[PDB]
Amino acid sequence: GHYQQEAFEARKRFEESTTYPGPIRAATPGDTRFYSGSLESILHDTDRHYWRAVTDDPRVQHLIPLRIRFKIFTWVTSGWEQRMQVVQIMAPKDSTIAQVKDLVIVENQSPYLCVSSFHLAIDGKELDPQKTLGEYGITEQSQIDAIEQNDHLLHRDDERPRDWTVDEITAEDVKRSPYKEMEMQPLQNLAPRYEARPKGYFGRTYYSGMKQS
Amino acid sequence: RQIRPYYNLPSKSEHGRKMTGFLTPYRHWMWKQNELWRNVHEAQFEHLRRVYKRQWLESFRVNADEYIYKYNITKAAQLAQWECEMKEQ
Amino acid sequence: ERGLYFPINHRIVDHRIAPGVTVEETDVQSRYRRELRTNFATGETRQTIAPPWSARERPTHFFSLRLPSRNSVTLRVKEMHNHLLFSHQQCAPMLVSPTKLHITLGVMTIPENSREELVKNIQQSMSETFACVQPLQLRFRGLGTFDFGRVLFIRVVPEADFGRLERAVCDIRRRVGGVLGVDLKGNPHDSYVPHVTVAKIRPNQRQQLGDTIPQSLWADYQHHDFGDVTLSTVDLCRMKGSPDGYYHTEGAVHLS
Amino acid sequence: FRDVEERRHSRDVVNELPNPWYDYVAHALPFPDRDAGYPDEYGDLGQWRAPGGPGSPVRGPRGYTAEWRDLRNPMRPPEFPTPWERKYRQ
Amino acid sequence: EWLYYKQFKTVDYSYRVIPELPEKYRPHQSGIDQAPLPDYREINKMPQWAECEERRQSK
Amino acid sequence: SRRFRYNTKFPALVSYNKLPWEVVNHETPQFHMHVAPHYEQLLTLAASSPVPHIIGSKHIDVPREHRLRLLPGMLYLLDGDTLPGEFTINRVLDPTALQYYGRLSSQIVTVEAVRMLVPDDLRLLCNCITFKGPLHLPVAPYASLASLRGASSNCFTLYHFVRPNRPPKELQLEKYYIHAPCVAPLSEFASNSDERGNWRPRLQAPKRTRRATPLPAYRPPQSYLMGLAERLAVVPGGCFGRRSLMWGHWF
Amino acid sequence: ARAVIKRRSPQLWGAPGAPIIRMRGHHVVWKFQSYDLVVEHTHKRRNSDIRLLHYLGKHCPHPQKSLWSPDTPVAQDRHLFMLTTVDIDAFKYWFGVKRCRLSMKPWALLAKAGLLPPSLTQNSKIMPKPLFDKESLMRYYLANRKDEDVMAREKYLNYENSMVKTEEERAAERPVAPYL
Amino acid sequence: RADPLNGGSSMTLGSKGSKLSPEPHRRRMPWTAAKEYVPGVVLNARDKMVLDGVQLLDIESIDRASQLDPLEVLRAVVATREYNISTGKNIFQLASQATYNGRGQRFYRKEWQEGTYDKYVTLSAIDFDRDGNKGTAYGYITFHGETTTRPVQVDFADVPGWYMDFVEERAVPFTGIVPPPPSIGTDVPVDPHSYRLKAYPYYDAPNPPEFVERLLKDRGVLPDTP
Amino acid sequence: ASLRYRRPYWMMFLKGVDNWKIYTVIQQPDHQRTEMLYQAWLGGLDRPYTRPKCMANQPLWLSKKRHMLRKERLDGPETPLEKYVLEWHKKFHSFQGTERPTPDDLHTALDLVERPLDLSYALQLLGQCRNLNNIRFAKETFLVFLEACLRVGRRDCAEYALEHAEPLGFWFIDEDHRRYLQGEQTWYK
RNA sequence: UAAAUUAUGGUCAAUUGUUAGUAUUCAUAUUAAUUUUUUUAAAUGUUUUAUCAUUUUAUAAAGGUUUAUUUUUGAAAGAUUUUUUGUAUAAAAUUUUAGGAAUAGUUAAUAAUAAUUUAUAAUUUUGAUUAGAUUGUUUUGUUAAUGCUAUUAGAUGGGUGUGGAAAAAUAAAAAAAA
Ligand SMILES: [Mg+2]
Ligand SMILES: [Mg+2]
Ligand SMILES: [Mg+2]
Ligand SMILES: [Mg+2]
Ligand SMILES: [Mg+2]
Ligand SMILES: [Mg+2]
User: Fold this and answer.
1) Which residues in A lie closer than 8 A to residue F170 (C-beta atoms)?
2) B15: which chain E residues are within 8 Å (Cβ-Cβ)?
3) Phi, psi dihedrals of residue H113, rounded to the nearest 5°
4) A GO CC term (chain I) (predicted)?
5) Bases in strand J with any atom closer than 7 Å to a protein CB
6) Does the CB of C20 sit below 7 A from strand J?
7) Do residues H21 and F234 lie in contact, with contact meaning Cβ atoms separated by under 8 Å?
8) C-alpha dihedral sign at C11, C15, C20, C25
9) Which H or E element spans position I184?
10) In terms of Cα–Cα distance, which of F95, F74, F93, F92 is closest to F84?
11) Which of A104, B31, D48, H91 is most buried, taking the most CB atoms under 10 A from its CB?
């Protein structure tokens, strides 16, 4: 927006400076890990946990915190939901999209995400695994989605998982997959104990961006 | 509470409450009248709310500022005294 | 069950995301403790950073404390090399030859036209700075990285005559870059971090070798002790690997 | 209702008289303006001590100065000869 | 209203409907066995009106 | 209610209370529900001022390789009826789905046909909408649609490529909401028109000997009502408007 | 949001709710009974002090003879007295800035004091509640409606800033010769 | 929050309203949004006294001994139809009888046409599920000569309060596409003779005289003798 | 007065289910084997079984398999009509059906009447096509129904259909067909 | 290492036993209490709503805790429309028993790891952990007075985790959407 081009412009015009001595690192502090509060808060690299009234020299970011969004199927106890889960890496500035995929694959802790091969895409357009972030103008503000193999097959009832509400889960598939790990047959402590949302939550029509009545 | 009269639309159900609030157009009209009256009240009422808000803010401006006057003079006095004591030191 | 219910190390809020997001819209996962892992752990070091215009040009000459023969340093670095090559022989192009070991006290860009005037003047001012300083006994233990893990070096511990060094350096810094305007890669009002560069990855190499020296090599030597050394000799050098089996030397000063 | 009231309000003469309760807030601040009778650093009661003393916050601090000029020797006759009674000036 | 709700064990008299849990809440534990399998030919015997209308259909 | 600051409550990995991510399914009617009212705006824009990638010629051709890094998001208008190379054809005859094109068809070009096209691999999509006849909007000379024969051979088509089962974002229609005026009503007074002299001004309001005919006498409703719509927070019709103004609800 | 509602002491909207100004006292023999005007939350606990924002005052509901004043042949003044201590700055703060609520009996008090117009619940059952119709009201309104800017200026002085700067104090505050 | 009643004015609790805003007051419960509702209890409540003296059979009772005279069956059917309209007519009961399932016709519920309230629905399309009398009904709301831009699921289609009137003019075949009717301000130039506005944003109806009588005879202004 | 705070969250908007407190305690072992016995008592399964974790209702698939294992009545079909009636119940009463009858299938079904029994059947199916499924008839509908009233020689039902044609919903009756039951001839050919 | 005055200022400290050679706070005294007496409490049905549902209504049951108990605004307050912000869960001090010994799902680093990650780990005689007693840091009584001697009550784990916050299963005396 405004900030992005204001700051970009500032950087560009600061690099074209003929006469500059350079900063004095005695006067340019880092950040603290020691501050009041229980929680550990991670901030921007231009921001600090103390009050610094003076504006620091624009620096170029050598690690860009990319976000990569996946579709996930959550078990909500009335059936399946499809919602969004982000992975966040720190990708070196000049890195190749191939290498970004690799970073992503190493940084997800959910067993339900990276199972098959996937392609990174911005606004639906696939990206070259061959080229740099520099060419595609990826600023960390950019919206980057992630498209799996079977994802265009989801409109069917096959690839989309089958919930024990409406479908048989058989001795075939009780020993395999999320179905196994879930423990459908109720135990005393009630099993993994997932989140539940009831049937009448959204009314008769499910959640939409457009008001349907 | 919300008053449910006897001539409200009766519900015939054994599984729930005996009378649903639904109105004879008369009752609705009546309600509108009484409501208008009360509106006449709360107009003045919350008018007085924002009056007192500005009153209090203003009096705060004046008194707090006077306090900064006096206090700053104090603070300056103490600071003078201290650096004097350090010359002496 | 083997510890705290929510381990305190796992409690992390990301404020670089957004106010409404993580409550409702989506949840963001990351391994957040790679980023939090600190300057002591990674082995990073904050060197005086160059202004952009100075950042563009290559350095030409540097100041160096010359290491004598029969060092503890050179010996132990040789042992370190052997150990490293036996572990991984991919290091072989990274490693600096034990003959080229020197301490780097500061780095500098000299234009080729005014060259003679500047070497004369520098050498003179340098001789004036160190006239009163007697030899320096410094301690070397620990490793650190410059340039995002591309340059791997031996630290100079401020436990010893190092103090004097810092004044000494900070004098030439204010002469060489302050007095006669010369490009020191940093600000002349700031002090350079003295170091012994051990392994390095140059721009040409970076394609076959990789973008960062993997920390698995030097992890175990990260805090290793290379010992004490006394230094009587200061040099101003132009960078050529060929001529003596050592860097081509444009000037010298004896500390005595 | 509002307008009728404003009318017959402004019509009567016993309005246009300031009402201390209706008009302002005397003191907005949570703390008092001057010291009232609360125990001292020694724990003594308000009645036991008078403010303005040694416990009170400190007041702080070649040629001739402007304080030199105004001053005058009592041997010389002053400015306008105010008839002081001799006894008082003793 | 209130008398209707009172039959429920609601602790606060809340106009909510809260059932109980009897010892036998389901048929098999109350002793009842299945449901008797209907004899099919017995209920496929044509009704009276149908035969009488066969009698006025053949005339 | 406002959205809260951060989630410190539940582990992130499990993600807990999350509004479901909305996905647009091309098999169903709902798809069109999203895409249609966009199209109309789009066409409206095309009727007034030029937009670069809207009008194009002779379809498009790309390799199998670069197919998905080029196509998705693409929207362009062609003169004739020709269906894209390598697409299985699905006719949209189902009435519900059709229904959403109502506004676009009555107050813009009449819709002759709708087509859902799916490729061999099934991973792409094309929404193909064939209009018949001239627009019921006026078209300007310097506008994009003025470069087309189908408007102003009376059939022409809109082609929209997209990926299936994606959120109703990455079908890109929102870049098109640029608003340019229809200059048709003022074209009458331009130096170009010869009917500009048949115009005469009303500067002064005419002298009125009458009052507005009083509205029909009010019949109070006879049935049971749900109570004040004010106190129930119902907008005046349950339709639109502010809850402070209760106009047009029963009283 | 309690599973089993505490049945006897219900309230709107959960806890602790809005700040409200209440009148309360421990119950005793009528002869000695006093009340307290208290700003406090909507949901009280066992002891009223846990949620107590401020203490607005004592109120004694016993008509008193005034023995403090000298016995006065003026008729009015020898009516009995009713004694109440209002803290009016915390009142104007809590009510004005913090936007309080009000129970009815405190409202009646604050009305007798001239802080608030009399309550909704004070009824001379002599008069009825009024009637209304839009077009008669409209005729009265078309008859008298003040000018736009006069009214805007009213709303300005009442709600926004009151103290303003007349020409003279401007002219008095602007810097003189050596910096002018 | 978003849109209060009389601004914030707190002088009573009821002073706010029976809801604070149209929007859901907790974000975790969406359905609490302010709608316009209908008395479901009464308007379902179908009369079982029309089913008296009938002998209904059942769906899966097909048996030869089970069923009855064709005459009996006929009067049973008539009593069942009489059972279903026993309150009012459901939309899918109106639409199945009209040509083309009543596409284009204007479905108004009773109360929408009386008082200053004026509203109806131009039906876009219909789905019958296996059961009639239930289903999904889409269309365009028209409120005081103002019309919706896109179709919407018609709410409370299943509640039997609905009336409509069959006009051949509005009928559309399943081939074409139901057009949204014109909003009288914009697409059709406004005219007084064809359409006059019942009530507008600042208007409200004058007082009916007998309500006034009742209220005064209540509050005890106008006397009332037994 | 909602049960929000009385029962587990997932039980929200739970209506019509019998004694719902049941489904709160099903995890406890005794309640659970009680359920095993219940399901077995309901039958239709080869194995010991229990309904899934938080589910109050039975699964869709299970009640479907209960419904399709439940033997239909009428095991003796004689007339083509009774065959077509059992098929009618197979197609259009199938558990959770989308599909709905067409007036033409009612024609086909009304053309197979022979004995009065069959007239009763087809008339009940017609009762289902009016009241249950809400289907509009055509012109020829009352022609078919009339001739089928005539085949079994019961004309009472025809005139009963005439005196009120609105509840049965015959929207078109050719006036001559009225005449036939109202006292006038010249109907066929 | 000198006195002081423009003279009582800055607002009250004041102790009461008739004993029995002598040494030592010890019977009978007063004040405060228990012995001691029905003049301050109270009864059940919480309540709306769109109907078998869904909105409103969050700290008095017991268990015995001495290195111990700590927190937000997303609810309401709350004002105009839609996005809109950051601040919080952490600590420090005070801790009883006449005769006194070891304690343990265990520390710290790594990290959204490890029922077998790594390490020369953590608590204790400056009194720990078990065990006994006991409701924690403005409340009383006695007294001229540094003391001695009281202070109630109230937060008791998890197991479809709702809710802004668990404080959620009789026991109000809190007007709970006309
Ligand atoms: Mg308790
Ligand atoms: Mg203990
Ligand atoms: Mg402590
Ligand atoms: Mg603590
Ligand atoms: Mg709010
Ligand atoms: Mg428990």
Assistant:
1) 123-124, 145
2) 17
3) -100, 0
4) cytoplasm
5) 10-12, 39-42, 44-60, 73-90, 105-107, 110-115, 153-154, 159-178
6) yes
7) no
8) negative
9) none
10) F74
11) H91
